[PDB]
Design a protein around this ligand. Structure first.
Ligand code: ADP
Ligand code: ADP
Ligand code: ADP
Ligand code: MG
Ligand code: MG
Ligand code: MG
Lengths: 48, 538, 525, 527
């Protein structure tokens, strides 16, 4: 919930300027792909 | 377990209609939001490409304008923080006359960035001290950004060039004509003595012929008609009276006591003879025009018509005083004939009709005089009112130039240079105040950003180009609104300049309003009363 | 309830209910007013019903502008009003001490103890505290530096630091100007005139007067270099006969004669003024200014302006004495015998125009016993806040001058007095030692609230300060920047001795009276 | 003003210090109401319902349920006290008082800027130390009749009048010892609590048998059987309809008579089985049969049984099957397919008692009943209800005391000793949790305070006297409610249930910690 609120705030920042929401959405999706990649990269295994 | 009672203490002791807001989220963020919303409402009218707004007050009175002060005055602003911002804008209008929209934009940007800084972790006091330090640094920097000076004010061409920029934001399509008109009107005024009076410029609004037909008159124009038969005088010798054009009466109580038939038969005849003698005594001095501040008696009017005297009746005492200043006469308190020093002289007084309205014109011929009048034509009352506001802005700009002759580049060049140098200064300052200083510097970007948004281009590209050019060392480069793509040009050659005093006072007042809003921590609002306005406002 | 049987529509709170209600109201007021204390306090916003905006942290103003409808709140508000009326400072501390006294008393009352014992302990502790305050006061020669320190200690808590710095010099200079040696200070001789056209830091002291009205005749001079001031209270306009005179004539010539002869009474006084002006100054170098408490009709204004005389009408009543003391002339109620010795002197008189309003300045007096502070600010609420601050500063400086003693501030005297009360507690006979302990704990509220407002923690700062005071014996207060114990006398944080004495007396009296209330009644309907 | 109010305009929110103040005020109000309940010197409260029913009580839980309160924190405390009553049966008033005093002492330091988390940490540390000390101080002992009498007295004296309490002590102790099997859990369901409204309150007593609130329906049926065989059955002896919608079809009146006579053969078979069993068991008129049936008996079967001199009851309670099998010693039967004298109970006396309109049946003089009944008698309904609550509390106290052989000295002695132990242990706690430990000790000190206050003595003087005596002597001294002097509760005979004290500590600490950590109260479920 907190993450969604923060991302929407930083998106409102750009929406105040003359940036179309589609550009922000595409940037968000690319960022999400990189977030997933980094999380998978920094993970560690566990002996169950 | 179905209701939440009020907490014991202040919550229960509060009145039924009162409201209490305490803490950051409840007070400071709400105030910042209200100020940001007000700035957003007033933003779109900034710059030459600003758009007019039709504002209708509670009395169904139209106001089509792009003047921020007028818009705020006609808006029923209710949020008290927005009330402080509006008061700061009105103070800027009173002190200088231009830059109100700058005050709004700067205050809104400052409060937005203050909200950001409070969110990231800074305390209110640290933000306030950083803002004050940055304001001091900006005021120190500002004199170094002066590009040129007026260097003369009795000229017409260069005064018009100076005043063009002030009245280019409003009436963007046709500002050269208005610049020439206001320059002529102001140069007629402003004698050898350095004192310049704004009230000496009069605006007369006559409807019908379009604003291109407006003219400037070295005199006064009154929308009245002559009381008598004479309607034109070529060598006027005006004698001004503050008393009614009638035989004066006792102030205690008048009672004509008649005791014989002869007194009854002679009283009216003697009164008429006295009136005739007084009028002829006035006329014998050569006064062919008489102006009075009160009513005109029938017998007095008849005897004035007999001696060919032009009568004008002015109800307003302000108009009487202005006419006395224009012609050079003294408003006599009694109906005695005027001595040679008290008699005013005007080169032409006549009755004329412009469009539909009948007017009386006290016209000089020399390019001088105490009071000058601008007659404004047009096709709409609202359009003439907007042109009058533009003329007021131009006259205030001329007055400021008389006060201080220094100028700074416009179109965001000064704002961008200030932002760059404040950022450079804040990058060297250690401590937590560097964030506040940098945010204060960034707040200056809202001016070129607003100009670009109103012009219809990409603001970010314009700002990046402005930073690049200013880093190259060009301090006189601003937004070029005469282009369909983001472009910049030198504003010294373009002649787009702003008064130093205007920028100084606007920055000071905006910073003061922002820090004053930030200082508020708790709000206690009484129940909104239904009283018919406070007695102070009558 | 017995009362409800007689008056069914009556509200009654009896026994422990009355104590609960009173203590709850006091705690609510204390919780609201905690944030006011100290220069690090929070600024409050007060919006009236009509929409007016007031920014303040003054205790009395906040109490008057809170939307509160509670009886105990009204009692505490009246106590604070008396505090402000007499001493002009200490209202926030008054409310805080009252609330903390009530809370500490309840701490023992809720455990089955009767309030009378607590009141006896309160009286004993109050007596001991007054003795300690007499012992600890610092008698000093009230030079300029000490007055500046006191003015700073007040104004910094009232307004912005730089604005307080300016107001210190203004207030101290004004007080030193109007002060006669071995004579009570009259604060009516300081006119507080406010203008609304420049920044708040432009507030200054004028060694003269500023009048909110100007000349009503356009031809009168706007600036006079060397002026003879004629302070008069004589009507110069047309006046009706008291006995319903009326006029009777039989011709127009008779009417003209009556009109010309009905102004002779006023014209005689105007001619007297003109003759005096001609006699006093036979050249154009000097100037003549007439300030009248009553109106002047346009004919007299024209007659005076023909002689180069600046005339101001409808002046304020206090301005008569203010001009008499500053310019040095004398107020006149008639012109029966007026001589050049009745005229004041001013080294500069000029008029200032601000929008519709016009102001007249009278400066460069010889030795002005009455001066004015000119409040300048961009907003109305700024002017009101500066007016409150300068009132507090003037009261503080006058109190400091009145008695040569002064008390260290920053809560140091509270800590030392609480320590002395704790030491003296064993000497108190009976269970009143509990009341003495409650009084000491209540007195300790000021350093606690100062620590809160400065951002530190109550217990750590308080124990540090108390340990420092016990180890050294000095008067150590609260350092609002570091939180460490600090000697208030060395740094120049001074409190008014009269303010502290009034605080102790009023707080103890009101707390004792409230604690003994056992029933609240509303049965007058 | 708040975020929730912005989203939901008609939402009530108390945030930050407001929520804590509201919770503390509610707890203090509940504590102020329930102060007067504690101790045998407490005061009766009369509670009138909407319908006008009058209830006299001093029980904390009973008072809480009948309090006209609609507060959230009050609801939480009421639920905690309800659980306390449900599991242990005692300590509800002490529960509320300890919770309120914990909250008050916590607020004492919270109002000075201290964070509630530190207070909660101190609370948990002090609770652990107090539990250790309670384990140290308990009195393990094999519990004969005297100790049970003392515990039942310590409960009933605080619940009812001294004389009524003295009678009820013998009643409850004898009943519990009657139903108590060796090293087995006690089934409190096996003590019937029956009420009649004809004698004085001191006439309540214990019957070593069973009492039924219904009697025989057939008037000719015997009223008093001296020697009785008890037959406990769950067989319907009334007319039963066929499950598959039979219906009768006939063509003449004689056929209708034959069908009418034949349709009762099924029930008559069971009735004649019972009759044959009765004739086989007792061929003389000396003995008798009592037939308690959980299901109804139609008048025909009642008349047929009465013709053989058999007394029989219908529509008995479900629990009465087990109660009779444990008291009389028979076997509850769901069918008479194979019934033998071995399944018949015994009873040395069965008689019917009539009280106004209603009837009662007494089964007495059993061999060795493992299920007895407690007979509540009084002149008023509210008297019966009060005695019922007192008997329930006494039964729970005795059962708890029997469960764990240990027992704790009462009169607030254990509270004072635990407070002193916590004070001594306070320096061992690191950080500012010592403040929470001190608050916990002061909260524990509420019991002697309230006891002395209710007895009319000075609270602080009595408390300091008790504390000084305990510190100097080291014994477990309580509060004497007649003189106010310190008294050894163990020697006098004022005992408290150890499980009750442990549950009090655990529940009070948990609920106080949970309330102290609440910073927002929201009601935004509407719309
Ligand atoms: N020809 C122009 N090109 C670019 N910018 C301009 C031009 N003329 C004026 N401006 C800018 O417009 C701004 C004036 O905006 P305006 O609508 O007058 O608001 P305000 O009345 O508050 O000053 C000035 O800061 C100036 O830099
Ligand atoms: N610079 C300072 N450092 C430390 N303590 C101060 C300083 N200035 C004032 N104080 C203390 O804070 C208190 C200010 O109280 P104030 O806000 O003036 O309440 P009131 O207006 O009711 O007197 C004084 O009692 C003084 O002892
Ligand atoms: N005769 C007595 N003398 C002294 N103390 C007693 C006596 N009887 C009971 N007490 C004390 O008083 C308390 C009674 O509490 P009680 O009213 O039963 O609360 P609850 O009903 O919630 O258990 C017990 O804790 C016990 O220690
Ligand atoms: Mg402008
Ligand atoms: Mg003060
Ligand atoms: Mg109990």
């Amino acid at each position: 919930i907190i993450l969604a609120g923060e991302m929407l705030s930083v998106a409102e920042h750009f929406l105040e300027q003359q940036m179309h929401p589609t550009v922000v959405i595409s940037a968000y999706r690319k960022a999400l792909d990189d977030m997933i990649s980094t999380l998978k990269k920094i993970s560690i295994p566990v002996d169950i | 377990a179905l209701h939440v009672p009020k907490a014991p203490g202040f919550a229960q002791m509060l009145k039924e209609g009162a409201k209490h807001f305490s803490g950051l989220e409840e007070a400071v963020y709400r105030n910042i939001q209200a100020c940001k919303e007000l700035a957003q409402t007033t933003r779109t009218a900034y710059g030459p490409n600003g758009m007019n707004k039709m504002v209708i007050n509670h009395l169904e009175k139209l106001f089509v304008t792009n003047d921020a002060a007028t818009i705020l005055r006609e808006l029923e602003v209710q949020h008290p923080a927005a009330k402080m911002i509006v008061m700061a804008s009105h103070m800027q209008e009173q002190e200088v006359g231009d830059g109100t929209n700058f005050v709004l934009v700067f205050a809104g940007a400052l409060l937005e960035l203050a909200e950001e800084l409070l969110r990231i972790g800074l305390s209110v006091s640290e933000v306030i001290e950083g803002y004050e330090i940055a304001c001091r640094k900006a005021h120190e920097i500002l004199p170094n950004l002066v590009c040129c000076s007026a260097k003369n004010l009795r000229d017409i061409d260069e005064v018009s060039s100076l005043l063009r920029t002030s009245i280019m934001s409003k009436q963007y399509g046709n500002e050269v004509f208005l610049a020439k008109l206001i320059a002529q009107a102001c140069v007629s005024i402003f004698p050898d003595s350095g004192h310049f009076n704004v009230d000496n410029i009069r605006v007369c609004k006559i409807l019908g012929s379009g604003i291109s037909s407006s003219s400037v008159l070295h005199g006064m124009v009154f929308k009245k008609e002559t009381e008598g038969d004479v309607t034109s005088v070529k060598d006027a010798k005006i004698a001004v009276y503050s008393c009614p054009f009638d035989g004066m009466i006792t102030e205690t109580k008048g009672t004509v006591l008649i005791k014989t038939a002869e007194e009854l038969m002679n009283f009216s005849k003697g009164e008429e003879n006295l009136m005739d003698a007084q009028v002829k005594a006035i006329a014998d001095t050569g006064a062919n025009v008489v102006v009075t501040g009160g009513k005109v008696a029938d017998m007095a009017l008849h005897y004035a018509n007999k001696y060919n005297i032009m009568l004008v009746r002015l109800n307003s005492k302000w108009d009487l005083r202005r006419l006395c200043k224009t012609v050079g006469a003294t408003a006599l308190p009694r109906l005695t004939p005027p001595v040679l020093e008290e008699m005013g002289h005007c080169d032409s007084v006549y009755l004329s009709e412009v469009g539909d309205t009948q007017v009386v014109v006290f016209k000089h011929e020399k390019e001088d005089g105490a009071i000058s009048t601008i007659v404004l034509r047009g096709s709409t009352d609202n359009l003439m009112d907007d042109i009058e506001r533009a003329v007021d802005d131009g006259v205030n700009t001329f007055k400021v130039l008389t006060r201080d002759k220094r100028l700074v580049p416009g179109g965001g060049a000064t704002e961008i240079e200030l932002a760059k140098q404040i950022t450079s200064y804040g990058e060297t300052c250690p401590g937590l105040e560097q964030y506040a200083i940098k945010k204060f510097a960034e707040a200056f970007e809202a001016i070129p950003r607003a100009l670009a948004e109103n012009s219809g281009v990409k603001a970010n590209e314009v700002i990046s180009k402005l930073y690049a050019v200013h880093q190259e060392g060009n301090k006189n480069v601003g937004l070029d609104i005469e282009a369909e793509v983001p472009a910049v040009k030198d504003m010294l050659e373009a002649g787009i300049l702003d008064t130093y005093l205007g920028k100084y006072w606007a920055i000071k007042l905006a910073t003061n309003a922002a820090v004053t809003v930030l200082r508020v921590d708790q709000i206690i609002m009484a129940k909104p009363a239904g009283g018919p306005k406070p007695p102070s406002g009558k | 309830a017995a009362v409800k049987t007689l008056n069914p529509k009556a509200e009654v709170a009896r026994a422990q209910a009355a104590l609960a209600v009173n203590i709850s109201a006091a705690r609510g007021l204390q919780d609201v007013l905690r944030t006011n204390l100290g220069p690090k306090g929070t600024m409050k916003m007060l919006v009236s019903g009509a929409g007016d905006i007031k920014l303040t942290k003054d205790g009395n103003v906040l109490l008057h502008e809170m939307q509160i409808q509670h009886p105990t709140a009204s009692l505490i508000a009246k106590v604070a009003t008396a505090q402000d009326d007499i001493t002009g400072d200490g209202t926030t501390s008054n409310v805080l001490i009252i609330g903390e006294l009530l809370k500490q008393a309840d701490l023992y009352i809720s455990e089955g103890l009767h309030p009378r014992i607590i009141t006896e302990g309160f009286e004993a502790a109050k007596e001991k505290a007054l003795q300690f305050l007499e012992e600890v006061k610092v008698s000093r020669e009230m030079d300029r530096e000490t007055l500046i320190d006191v003015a700073r200690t007040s104004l910094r808590t009232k307004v912005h630091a730089e604005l307080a710095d300016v107001l210190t010099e203004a207030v101290v200079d004004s007080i030193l100007a109007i002060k006669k040696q071995d004579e009570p200070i009259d604060l009516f001789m300081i006119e507080i005139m406010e203008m609304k056209h420049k920044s708040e830091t432009d507030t200054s002291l004028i060694r003269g007067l500023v009048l909110d009205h100007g000349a009503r005749h356009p031809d009168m001079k706007k600036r006079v270099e060397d002026a003879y001031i004629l302070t008069c209270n004589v009507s110069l306009e047309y006046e009706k006969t008291e006995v319903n005179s009326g006029f009777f004539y039989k011709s127009a010539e008779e009417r003209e004669k009556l009109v010309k002869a009905e102004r002779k009474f006023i014209e005689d006084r105007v001619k007297k003024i003109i003759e005096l002006k001609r006699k006093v100054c036979g050249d154009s170098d000097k100037g003549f200014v007439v300030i009248n408490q009553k109106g002047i009709d346009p004919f007299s204004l024209d007659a005076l302006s023909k002689e180069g005389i600046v005339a101001l009408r409808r002046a304020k009543r206090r301005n008569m004495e203010r001009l008499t003391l500053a310019c040095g002339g004398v107020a006149l109620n008639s012109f029966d015998d007026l001589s050049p010795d009745c005229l004041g002197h001013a080294g500069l008189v000029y008029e200032y125009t601000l929008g519709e309003e016009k102001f007249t300045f009278i400066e460069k007096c010889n030795n002005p016993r009455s001066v004015t502070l000119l409040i300048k600010g961009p907003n109305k609420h700024t002017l009101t806040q500066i007016k409150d601050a300068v009132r507090d500063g003037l009261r503080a400086v006058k109190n400091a001058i009145d008695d040569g003693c002064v008390v260290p501030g920053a809560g140091a005297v509270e800590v030392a007095m609480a320590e002395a009360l704790i030491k003296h507690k064993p000497s108190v006979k009976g269970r009143a030692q509990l009341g003495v302990q409650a009084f000491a704990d209540a007195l300790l509220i000021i350093p606690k609230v100062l620590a809160q407002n400065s951002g530190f923690d109550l217990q750590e700062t308080l124990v540090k300060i108390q340990a420092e005071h016990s180890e050294s014996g000095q008067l150590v207060g609260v350092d609002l920047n570091t939180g460490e114990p600090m000697v208030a006398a060395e740094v120049g944080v001074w409190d008014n001795y009269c303010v502290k004495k009034q605080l102790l007396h009023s707080c103890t009296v009101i707390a004792t009276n409230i604690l003994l209330v056992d029933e609240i009644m509303r049965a007058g309907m």
